[PDB]
Every structure is written in structure tokens, then in C-alpha cells.
From Swiss-Prot:
Annotated Gene Ontology cellular component terms: axon; cell cortex; centrosome; ciliary basal body; cytosol; dendrite cytoplasm; early endosome; endoplasmic reticulum
Ranges that cross the membrane: none
Ranges of residues in domain Protein kinase: 26-284
Active-site residues, Swiss-Prot/TrEMBL: D144 (proton acceptor)
Pfam family, one: Pkinase
Cell compartment(s), UniProt: Cytoplasm, Cytoskeleton, Microtubule organizing center, Centrosome; Cytoplasm, Cytoskeleton, Microtubule organizing center, Spindle pole body; Cytoplasm; Nucleus
Annotated protein name in UniProt: Dual specificity mitogen-activated protein kinase kinase 1
Alphabetical GO biological process terms: Bergmann glial cell differentiation; cell motility; cellular senescence; central nervous system neuron differentiation; cerebellar cortex formation; chemotaxis; endodermal cell differentiation; epithelial cell proliferation involved in lung morphogenesis
PANTHER family tied to this protein: DUAL SPECIFICITY MITOGEN-ACTIVATED PROTEIN KINASE KINASE DSOR1-LIKE PROTEIN, MITOGEN-ACTIVATED PROTEIN KINASE KINASE 1
Positions where Phosphoserine occurs in the chain: S172, S176
Enzyme class: transferase
E.C. no: 2.7.12.2
Amino acid sequence: DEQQRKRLEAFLTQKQKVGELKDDDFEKISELGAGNGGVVFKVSHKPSGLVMARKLIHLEIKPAIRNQIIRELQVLHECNSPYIVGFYGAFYSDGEISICMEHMDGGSLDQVLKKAGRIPEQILGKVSIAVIKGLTYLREKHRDVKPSNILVNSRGEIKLCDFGVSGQLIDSMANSFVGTRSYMSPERLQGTHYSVQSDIWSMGLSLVEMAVGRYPIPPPDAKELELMFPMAIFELLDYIVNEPPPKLPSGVFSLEFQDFVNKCLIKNPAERADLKQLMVHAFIKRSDAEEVDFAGWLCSTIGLN
Ligand SMILES: *[C@H]1CC(=O)[C@@H](O)[C@@H](O)C/C=C/c2cc(NC)cc(O)c2C(=O)O[C@@H](C)[C@@H]1C
Ligand SMILES: [Mg+2]
């Protein structure tokens, strides 16, 4: 796409001007989406004038380990796609790794979900297209999919944010903190290990969460649906592994959307749909030919002006 080629080359143009990144070059503007493994700040890169998002991972380790993490992250400089958050750079300074990224003014979809209550079907169609393309980019040029990892902006863009190219980095945060496992596929929880197929599962679950406005397991056996229209993490993960997958309620959502998530959420990974299959699924082909005002919906919902 041409508007997409123009924005990708504008990004790189701006990025070519920045040069090597250093702590003392950054001014704090605010804190964003803080929590998780590290805090995140909106920052100004004073020399260039660029606003950026900076993730800080407090870690105390050997100069070797950190020099390795920094080099493994350089990998992200070649990942240029409209569906992946722009990466400016990564460095270490005074006990903490920094990862600097394009500032997505819409934030992440967990935040948008909190504010909107639930995300409409037609918007989730756009989200689905972006995630599928994003995931198709990562496979064709070589993950953890959940609402907090999908960022959005006022230009209508939807992108994945991920720093798990390193691994060793993840290696060394385990003793410090560990990201939630409540989006992992039953076959990762049973140890079989990743395939792109486990990210389809996660995409499916995230979409149901955003549709209904709540983490969907366990099902809302209640009038909560009627209202709509406790489990410890270990009870939950058994539940994922042993019980049937969640689904959308009926009536409220189109059958095509129901079917799309059902196919992402099939427990057996061999039977669960693949990306080639999702790309041509009817929900997707229909969503692709709707012209949905995502920016307009987004700006209204979170109060961007
Ligand atoms: C993205 C992934 C990440 O670590 C997630 O935990 C995010 O939910 C944290 C949110 C980051 C964020 C938030 C805003 N809000 C206005 C804007 C952004 O551009 C980012 C962002 O780019 O996060 C990057 C730094 C991480 C690595
Ligand atoms: Mg300093």
C-alpha cells in the first residue's frame, strides 16, 4: 500500500537522524502503561526533538549478559512493518535496560478496553486484520498476543509491541518478574511449545475479552450476560487446559465473528486454524471491505483532542 510505504519511509528518515541513544539524552514527559516488567515513560529525545516511549527494565547483571541483550535487540532495527511498533533503539544505563519505541498516542487495547467497556465488532475486525498481518510479518521474516500488547494511534494504526526477540533478556527477568500466562494456549500450558498456532489462540482469547469487556475464563455463568447485554492463576490454567474454550455469546455478535474466534480457540493446535486460513476467513474478508472509522471511534472513546 502507498500511504503505508510513505509512512514507513518517513519513520526511517526520522530515525536515521537520531543516531546512538544515551540516557542523558532523554527528558521525561509522563508515565504510560506503567506496570508489568518495567515502567514505561513518554519521553522527549532532546537532540532530535522526537517523542518516544521508553521501557525501562531494572536488572542487575554482568557486563557480558547486558552487552548480549543489547546486541540481540539490534535485531529489531530490521523489523520494518506497518503492523509492528517502530523501534528506535535499545541501551543499558545505571542498572536498567532501555527500549525505545514509537509513541502510539492511543495506548494499548487493555487501556482502551477499560475506558470503552467493550469494543465493537467492526473495530475488532480491523484489529484482527492488523494482528494477523503483524503475525504474518514476524513468521515470513524469522511471541505473546494480548490486549496490552496491541497499541493504537489517532491515525487509525494498529500494531504489535514486542521485545521477545532477545530471549536472554526474558531469561534474566524471570528471577525478577514474569508476565501473565493466562493468554497461553492449552498446548503451551501442557509444554508442547510454541508454533504460530499458539498466538492464534491468544489472538482468539483477546478478541473475546475485548468483545465482551472481561477476561472470558471462566464463562460468565450468570445473568452477567444479562447484566452485560474467584479463581487463582493456577486454578485458571488448569481450567484452560481441562475445560472447553470460551466463546462469544449468541444474538449479540454476527455468526461470522463467532466462527472466526471459535476457529482460533479450538484446543487441538493441528485443527485450530492457521494464518493463511484466517486471512481468507469470512469475518476477515468482510471486515476488510468495511470502511470503518477506527480513528474517529478511537478519538471519541478515549477523549483524544
Ligand atoms: C510495548 C509492549 C509493552 O511492554 C506493553 O506492556 C505495553 O502495554 C506498555 C505500554 C506501552 C506504551 C504505551 C503508550 N501509551 C500512550 C504508548 C506506547 O508507544 C507504548 C509503547 O510503545 O510501549 C513500548 C515501549 C513497549 C515495549
Ligand atoms: Mg545518566
